Design a protein around this ligand. Structure first.
Ligand code: L82
Ligand code: CA
Ligand code: CA
Ligand code: CA
Ligand code: CA
Ligand code: ZN
Ligand code: ZN
Ligand code: ZN
Ligand code: ZN
Lengths: 231, 231
């Protein structure tokens, strides 16, 4: 995939001058190697991370890659729900003294989901927007809770100053034939939540997501239409 | 129901010097009348309400019983999830000038659930406790989000200075043979959420719930044991 950089067993792709996608892989029984994507954002003299890799050792390699390619300190990480692809590498962040943030519900669920909770909890208004007091110095990361979907706690992140919005595991690409792992999903509200993400980030033309390469806005509508079939 | 009062279609039962249960009924298509309970709390010179009745008219009857029998202003109501038994009467509360509070997630889901949102949104720390700035002047009402269960947004309320805690629709009585309406339930996390409610209010000995008469703490552990079988 031209423009991908391999760094150990992780892949990094630059999406914009100050934004990269990090990709890590799990061997899955019945699936083979499964990719999970998150984001790295350079914001002045600091770096902000969205989502861990699947494991601590892989997440440590994200930090090493950041040191080598960007060489600015990581100020914080946001993790977008309590599943292993997103929070499996929390100990690597905490070992490195990085402040971590998740939906309060993600932190509340983390023990039952076998995840380490983030240090800090985000809360949200009734319209889905993060309460700013709970997202200190998030810079360009604009966090939106679109409602229950892939999980009840899934959050999304727009990257202000860019055309990029991150749908996490709520959004699948427009070529998807399924909505992936629905084990913890809210099948009643998933469609409205997918639609709410699209309405929250109207400027976004590149939709990044956990288990698909970046796609256009059609990923959002296609996802919402697949979810409509669950109701 | 010796000692119970009737006002219109509503039934009232005093649980403590300053606490009453309100009960309203919806005649459902193919079960018959279904009771739903909430609370009325006298807090010095004001009244606090937990949950509406099923309908606006029934909710107005609650408020008129309060004016007749207690004759103190209702300062606020907190509603415990976005279903009709708990939020069906929001328009009546608002017509009466009562400030209304609900979990932010209840307010967000309310349109899809066919409910009117409360005015103000409660948010919660990762340990379940309400963030106090979102619950100003709640007096003895201690609001705790135990985690997803009967619905993702269900909240619970303890009344300081009494032996009473209100589980809403998360908790079923100790002789129940099922967990009732699981249509919007989180079957994976329900049992832990029920236990969390018990842990939040460890000294409560009277557990009030939406669809049975008050029970002892046995209701909490029975509900959790039933929920264990969902996993
Ligand atoms: O929870 C149930 O399914 C309904 C009550 C469900 C109440 N409800 C609703 C709702 C229901 C109808 C219309 C609008 C809203 N939204 N959220 C909740 S909550 N319950 C029967 C039951 C109980 C136990 C086992 C099986 N069914 C009420 C009940 C319980 C015990 C005795 C008599 N009635
Ligand atoms: Ca670990
Ligand atoms: Ca799970
Ligand atoms: Ca109404
Ligand atoms: Ca519903
Ligand atoms: Zn997930
Ligand atoms: Zn995922
Ligand atoms: Zn309900
Ligand atoms: Zn109920």
């Amino acid at each position: 995939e031209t423009g991908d950089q391999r760094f150990g067993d992780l892949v990094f792709r630059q999406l914009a001058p100050n934004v990269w996608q990090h990709t890590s892989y799990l061997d899955m029984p019945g699936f083979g190697a499964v990719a999970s994507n998150g984001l790295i954002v350079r914001d002045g003299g600091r770096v902000l991370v969205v989502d861990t890799a699947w494991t601590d050792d892989q997440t440590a390699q994200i930090l090493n890659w950041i040191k080598q390619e960007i060489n600015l300190p990581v100020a914080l990480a946001v993790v977008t729900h309590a599943h292993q692809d997103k929070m499996g590498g929390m100990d690597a962040l905490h070992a490195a003294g990085i402040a971590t943030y998740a939906n309060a519900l993600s932190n509340q669920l983390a023990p039952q989901e076998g995840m380490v909770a983030a240090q800090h909890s985000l809360t949200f208004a009734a319209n889905g927007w993060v309460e700013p007091a709970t997202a200190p110095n998030f810079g360009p990361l604009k966090v939106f809770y679109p409602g229950p979907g892939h999980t009840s706690d899934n959050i999304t992140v727009g990257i202000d100053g860019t055309d990029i919005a991150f749908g996490g595991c709520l959004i699948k690409d427009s070529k998807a034939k399924s909505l992936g792992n629905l084990g913890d999903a809210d099948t009643e509200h998933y469609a409205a939540s997918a639609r709410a993400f699209g309405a929250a980030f109207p400027k976004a033309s590149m939709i990044v997501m956990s288990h698909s390469a970046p796609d256009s806005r059609a990923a959002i509508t296609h996802t919402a239409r697949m979810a409509d079939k669950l109701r």
